[PDB]
Design a protein around this ligand. Structure first.
Ligand code: EQW
Length: 345
């Protein structure tokens, strides 16, 4: 006879399939552990989610689950199993079981110099995974080093689809300084000026920032607050061109930009003196101020920097491309419904 597993004062109720737990860290809405899987005879990662009291937590849990269960791709984390109570009434927590990865790119960048061959391979795998995501008409919207998982042979998987959305470019426009959720350092400049982050170009900017960070082990645009992020971006890209300003029709955003003293572009080869010149050409194209001129994922894959890996026949797309007002009680039923396939029976 035996009760639920405990780890650091919290119930971590995954057994009897999952045993031999070790703490990893804190996730979004709960604890992250590794565990031995007695069926497949491997250690696995498990995240405990407790979203049911809040509609926003519910929405994000459901999004992640629905997207990750639909998606199947070598460069996208899957869901192996989901543990929850057998009834809606007894269900307080949801545990998501995923492949156990050695590390993530955030941790790796804090401790390891990357060879040019490693940067190339990591960038390739990011864009290969992103090709799939974008082909499903989905935007990840929070791409950053801690959302890129790596195994001991440097295979890379994109994780955390909690902020993802279906692309909606005809409703992308908004006013100046409109609040935004995704991680500050990886936000494209247009977020602060006139964009809701509903186009694919939002994700390309983030990947551009990740590439820059792989080159120097330091975030390229480490802003400390909302409009400081734009200060950092303009400080390297320089003042936007007249043509690029003309595409910002909103007057508050345009006039803000016009009010600033002239800033020169900082050449990439001066910021990154050891970088491969083809890597810097692709970086320039991913960190293009004007999101209409920014390179797309499939163009990025075809760039000469990635020529050793590029193979469109081995860069699959989604077979089946793809909640704001639904309250938390209905979202519980949808989460209960979406996780039913993992139950006994
Ligand atoms: Cl879904 C998932 C989450 N984390 C891991 N692993 C950790 C190991 C410690 O470094 C950070 C990543 N694997 C899978």
């Amino acid at each position: 006879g035996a009760g639920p597993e405990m780890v650091r004062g919290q119930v971590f109720d995954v057994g009897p399939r999952y045993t031999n737990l070790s703490y990893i860290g804190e996730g979004a809405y709960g604890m992250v552990c590794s565990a031995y899987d007695n069926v497949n005879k491997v250690r696995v990662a498990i995240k405990k989610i407790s979203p049911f009291e809040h509609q926003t937590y519910c929405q994000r849990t459901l999004r992640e689950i629905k997207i990750l269960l639909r998606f199947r791709h070598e460069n996208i984390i899957g869901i192996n199993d989901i543990i929850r109570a057998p009834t809606i009434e007894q269900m307080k927590d949801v545990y998501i079981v995923q492949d156990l990865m050695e590390t993530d790119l955030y941790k790796l960048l804090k401790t390891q110099h990357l060879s040019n061959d490693h940067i190339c391979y990591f960038l390739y795998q990011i864009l290969r995974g992103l090709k799939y995501i974008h082909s499903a008409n989905v935007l990840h919207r929070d791409l950053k080093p801690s959302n890129l998982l790596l195994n001991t042979t440097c295979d890379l998987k994109i994780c955390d689809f909690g902020l993802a959305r279906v692309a909606d470019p005809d409703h992308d426009h908004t006013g100046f300084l409109t609040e935004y959720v995704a991680t500050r350092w990886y936000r494209a400049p247009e977020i602060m000026l006139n964009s809701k982050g509903y186009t694919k170009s939002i994700d390309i900017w983030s990947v551009g920032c990740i590439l820059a960070e792989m080159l120097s082990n330091r975030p390229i645009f480490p802003g400390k607050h909302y409009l400081d992020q734009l200060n950092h971006i303009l400080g390297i890209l320089g003042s936007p061109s007249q043509e690029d300003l003309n595409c910002i029709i909103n007057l508050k955003a345009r006039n803000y930009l016009l009010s600033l003293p002239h800033k020169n572009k900082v050449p990439w080869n001066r910021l990154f003196p050891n970088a491969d010149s083809k890597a810097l050409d692709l970086l320039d194209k991913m960190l293009t101020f004007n999101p209409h001129k920014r390179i797309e994922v499939e163009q990025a894959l075809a760039h000469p920097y990635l020529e050793q890996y590029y193979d469109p026949s081995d860069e699959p797309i989604a077979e089946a491309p793809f909640l704001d007002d639904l309250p938390k009680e209905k979202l519980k039923e949808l989460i209960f419904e979406e996780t039913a396939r993992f139950q006994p029976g």
